[PDB]
Each structure stands twice: as structure tokens, then as C-alpha cells.
Write a protein that binds this ligand. Structure first.
Ligand code: 33J
Length: 561
């Protein structure tokens, strides 16, 4: 059973905002504020019913053939332990405080109280490889639009354990998946690299067929054998005997399961599946999903199939054998996945147009550059990104989703017209363009200076990201519908706001004038010629798009010279 419950409630640790706070700045983004809600602990019971069930898992020679192949590639990886200090510097500054009298700032500053407790948690992992470690169960406060959705749940150990996880497994979860999975590992790609992989893979098939597979409650479908199988993959690496012991221990004491404690210290129940807030959530889920999907591909006898995995998110592109044969092949793949304990949520179906395949809430779309050439870029429905941006305008947040969206979806119609214009306008008026903001890229937290956005966008997306026009009608209709749905002003209100912001930025010189020139070139009557090359101070963007760290509690720093 994925979970058992004591009856104790999942409790909030503070007052939870449920509805969007009206603001004379929030209303300039969207009028219809009633459409925007935030999930709360009051819907935890609805989530608990969904995530609670018995698993049925039947492994076969296909699963075993794939596992052995993965284990072979895993054996070529050498991973080193991090020092207490290396692991302390990887902690986000607003990471949950320890129950042992210290917090993220104390960990990041290497306080004797933190460090000495971190040494003791570590010594216990080496001496006890059995006693379940305590975890906290919370309900996530995530902002959405109505179409009404229950709070997703977060399970995580204490700050001391989290630093110990980094020490034992940061090098593994950063290095291992790409070696084992190759081109199928999604987090090695920037949005543009993902699109390149998808478009080239589609173009490589005589008769392309594609599909996304949605596993219903993937974390709940992850059985204790699944977590023992990931550890056996981790143990295939060239590791020091101390890392091996800490990895074995972290597995049996934490990753396979353990007791759930609410915010007021009451025992909620017991977990026997994936913890969403441990270092290995991303890596483990990616390995497990790729393993199950790769073996199901063989069971289904799918022809020349290529898959792209990002945690629980899977997309498979193969050679179509006709609509009838493809539906039957997909029944075979779904039946195999079900046996491996990965049954579908939304049932999969073949698709014969790459724009119509959604994976990672995203799809490949097409636009034209300044020279009129076709440019494939990654887009998504802008509802959730826009609703979150409205919430971030009204109420202060530690992590700014609008900036991570501007970075990942920079070539898109909606990020450029709305998000860039809105937040550069706010930052100008507030005199805070220089101030670095915290945001997430593939789960990891980064402190990014907004004045560096033309340089960031150019490196990840290309100079075309500033000249894209003639977007597909399907993209336009989805964006247009969303503006009409949420009460977002039309293009003409955004072009005046953009021209005004552009003039104001150019008058300031420096990095500000670069933002004006580059970001808002779409606003002016006749676009200026833009040329490629580096900026006066080039950031180190190599650590970005290496691995996924969602739930991992990872914080990355930016170099420059
Ligand atoms: O060229 C286009 O296909 C479109 S479709 C569209 C549109 C569709 C529905 C609602 C609102 C806007 C606008 C454009 N664009 C133009 O007027 C010229 C380039 C620009 C986009 C470029 C990206 C930043 C914002 C403006």
C-alpha cells in the first residue's frame, strides 16, 4: 500500500491564501481575478484518497534486459562525496529550518551548531542502516486558474538529512542519468535543444507516430522494489565505501518509506512509495520511468522507438504501422506499463502531428524569424504561467515563476508580449532592475539579475528569439482564448506599454538599453537589425541543463569574470 493513514489531519504551518489579492498593478495583468485560486490543506483529504492504493507489479525478461543494460552504463560512472561545506553551499537560503535549532542561513554560513549536527546525522547513517527516518507531510500552495484542483502533497526529511543526501548523492543524481539514458534524458537539454531533439527524431522516421504517457500518481505507483532497483543502479557506480553505506542507509531508512508527521508533530501515517521532496525524486523517477517505458516498448513490439524522459513525464516517437496497428501497439504498451506498476491517468493515443503532442506541459510550435525562415520553439498553454504571474505581482514570493517562464519560454508570443512588458515596467517604476531575483530552472534555484536576460535568451534560444513573428494559428488561438478567459489586455495595450518601457530603458544606457533594444524590438514599427555575439560580461550558463532537481532542495550560484 502506497500510504496508510492514522486519521490525523494534514495541517498548515501558517495562514493559507486561497484567492488572488486585488492590486492596482495585478489588474493591469488580468481583470478576472475570480478565475485565480491557490491550493490549500483543506483539499489534502481529496488528494490522499487519490494517492492511496495497493500496487500490483509483475516484472519480466524485458524489464530485466533493460535493467542490466542500464546497470552496465551505470558501472562507467565515478561519483565523489561532497564535503559538509560543498553540500551546505547547495542549500537554498529559504529552505525549511531544522527541528534541531538551526536554519538555511546557519547551514549556508557553516555555523558550528549546523555543521556538528550535520556530522552527527551522517555518523548515524553509517552506523544504523535500518531505523526509518522522520518526514513531514504538507499540502503544496500552488496557484492555478479554474476550468477545483486538490493540493498536491510534499514529503521531506529534516534539513540535517537533506545536507547528508547532497553529500552522499549530489554527484550521482547530476552525472548518472545522462550516462545511463543517453539522448533520452530530458534535463540535459535547454528548451531549444529539446525541440531540436524532438523535431530531428520526428524527421528521422519514415512514417512518424508519437505519444505522451501520463502515469496516474507516478510517485504512488513507485513501489519499494522500484526504490531498491534505483539504489542497485546507484551501487553500480565507482563510489567510496562511505558513500555506499550512506546510500544503502538513505535508501532503507528514507527512500523506501517511513513515518509521516504533520506540522503540529502528530503522526499522519506511513509512506511506502516515492517521497516528493528528497534529492533522488527527479533521478529516481527518470530512471524508473525510462526503465518501465523502455521495457514496455519491447513488450508492445514498437518499431524504432525513441523516448524522452523528464521525471515521471514520458514522450515516445516511433515508426507508425497504420492507425489500427498503432492503437493495438499502444494497448500493448499501456498493458506492460500497468504490469510494471505505472498505469495511465489520461489513457495514451497515437498522434501524427508533433505540435499536438504535449510533454512537460509543453509542445513544439513553429514561427518565422527576420529572414522568414521556419523556427521551431517550445511553448505551452499560458494560463498557469499568467495566473502565477498575477499572484506574484500582488503578493511577494521567494521564487519568481514569471522569470523562469521568461527564460524557458522566451521565444513565445505570450512571454514576450505579456511577462516581459509587465515585469520590466514594474521593475523600472520600483527602481529594482539591478536587483537579482530567485527562480527555478529544472527544479534548482538560481539568483538571476533581470538586466542579463538578452544574454540568457540569446544563449539558450538564439538571436531569432527577438525576431519571431508569423506564429501558427493554433498557437494564436490558444493565447487569444486565454487573454479573453483571464481578462488580459490585447496586443495594442501591450505594444504601448512595451514602447514606453523600451524608451525608458534606452534612456538608462548599459544593460538596461540592451533590454530595450533586444527584448522589445517587436514593439517598434520597423524592427532594428540585431547581431549575434557576447555581452560585456558573459555569465557561466554551463551548470544549467545538466540535470533535474525538482524536490531536491538545490541552489546554484552564477559566475561571470
Ligand atoms: O506575428 C505574429 O504571429 C503575431 S500574433 C499576435 C497576437 C495574437 C493574439 C493576441 C495578441 C497578439 C501578435 C503578433 N505580433 C505582431 O503583431 C508582430 C510580432 C508580434 C508578436 C511577437 C512576440 C511578442 C508580442 C507580439
Amino acid at each position: 500500500a502506497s500510504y496508510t493513514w492514522t486519521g490525523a489531519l494534514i495541517t498548515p504551518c501558517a495562514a493559507e491564501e486561497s484567492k488572488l489579492p486585488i492590486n492596482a498593478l495585478s489588474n493591469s495583468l488580468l481583470r478576472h481575478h475570480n478565475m485565480v485560486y491557490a491550493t490549500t490543506s483543506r483539499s489534502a483529504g481529496l488528494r490522499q484518497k487519490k494517492v492511496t492504493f495497493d500496487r500490483l507489479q509483475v516484472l519480466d525478461d524485458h524489464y530485466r534486459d533493460v535493467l542490466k543494460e542500464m546497470k552496465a552504463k551505470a558501472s562507467t560512472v565515478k561519483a565523489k562525496l561532497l564535503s559538509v561545506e560543498e553540500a551546505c553551499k547547495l542549500t537554498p537560503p529559504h529552505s525549511a529550518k531544522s527541528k534541531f535549532g538551526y536554519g538555511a542561513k546557519d547551514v549556508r554560513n557553516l555555523s558550528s551548531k549546523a555543521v556538528n549536527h550535520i556530522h552527527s546525522v551522517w555518523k548515524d547513517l553509517l552506523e544504523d542502516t535500518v531505523t526509518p527516518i522522520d518526514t513531514t507531510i504538507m499540502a503544496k500552495n500552488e496557484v492555478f486558474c479554474v476550468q477545483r484542483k486538490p493540493a498536491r502533497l510534499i514529503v521531506f526529511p529534516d534539513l540535517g538529512v537533506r545536507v547528508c543526501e547532497k553529500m552522499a548523492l549530489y554527484d550521482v543524481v547530476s552525472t548518472l542519468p545522462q550516462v545511463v539514458m543517453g539522448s533520452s534524458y530530458g534535463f540535459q537539454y535547454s528548451p531549444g535543444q529539446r525541440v531540436e531533439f524532438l523535431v530531428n527524431t520526428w524527421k528521422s522516421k519514415k512514417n512518424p507516430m508519437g505519444f505522451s504517457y501520463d502515469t496516474r500518481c507516478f510517485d504512488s505507483t513507485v513501489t519499494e522494489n522500484d526504490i531498491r532497483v534505483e539504489e542497485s543502479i546507484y551501487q553500480c557506480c565507482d563510489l567510496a565505501p562511505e558513500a555506499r553505506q550512506a546510500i544503502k542507509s538513505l535508501t532503507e531508512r528514507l527512500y523506501i518509506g517511513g513515518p509521516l508527521t504533520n506540522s503540529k508533530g502528530q503522526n499522519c501515517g506511513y509512506r511506502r512509495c516515492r517521497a516528493s521532496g528528497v534529492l533522488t525524486t527527479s533521478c529516481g523517477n527518470t530512471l524508473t520511468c525510462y526503465l518501465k517505458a523502455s521495457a514496455a516498448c519491447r513488450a508492445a513490439k514498437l518499431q524504432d522507438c525513441t523516448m524522452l524522459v523528464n521525471g515521471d513525464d514520458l514522450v515516445v516517437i516511433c515508426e507508425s504501422a497504420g492507425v489500427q496497428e498503432d492503437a493495438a501497439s499502444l494497448r500493448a504498451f499501456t498493458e506492460a506499463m500497468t504490469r510494471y506498476s505505472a498505469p495511465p491517468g489520461d489513457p495514451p493515443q497515437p498522434e501524427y502531428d508533433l505540435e499536438l503532442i504535449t510533454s512537460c506541459s509543453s509542445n513544439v510550435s513553429v514561427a518565422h524569424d527576420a529572414s522568414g525562415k521556419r523556427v521551431y520553439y517550445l511553448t505551452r498553454d499560458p494560463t498557469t504561467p499568467l495566473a502565477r504571474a498575477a499572484w506574484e505581482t500582488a503578493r511577494h514570493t521567494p521564487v519568481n515563476s514569471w522569470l523562469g517562464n521568461i527564460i524557458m519560454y522566451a521565444p513565445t508570443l505570450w512571454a514576450r508580449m505579456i511577462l516581459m512588458t509587465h515585469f520590466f515596467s514594474i521593475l523600472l517604476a520600483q527602481e529594482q532592475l539591478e536587483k537579482a531575483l530567485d527562480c527555478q530552472i529544472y527544479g534548482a534555484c538560481y539568483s538571476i539579475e533581470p538586466l542579463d536576460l538578452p544574454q540568457i535568451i540569446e544563449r539558450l534560444h538564439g538571436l531569432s528569439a527577438f525576431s519571431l513573428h508569423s506564429y501558427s494559428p493554433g498557437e494564436i488561438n490558444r493565447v487569444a482564448s486565454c487573454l479573453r478567459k483571464l481578462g488580459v489586455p490585447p496586443l495594442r495595450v501591450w505594444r504601448h506599454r512595451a514602447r514606453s518601457v523600451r524608451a525608458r530603458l534606452l534612456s538608462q544606457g548599459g544593460r538596461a538599453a540592451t533590454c530595450g533594444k533586444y527584448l522589445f524590438n517587436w514593439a517598434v514599427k520597423t524592427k532594428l537589425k540585431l547581431f549575434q555575439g557576447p555581452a560585456a560580461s558573459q555569465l557561466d550558463l554551463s551548470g544549467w541543463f545538466v540535470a533535474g532537481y525538482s524536490g531536491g532542495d538545490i541552489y546554484h550560484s552564477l559566475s561571470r569574470a
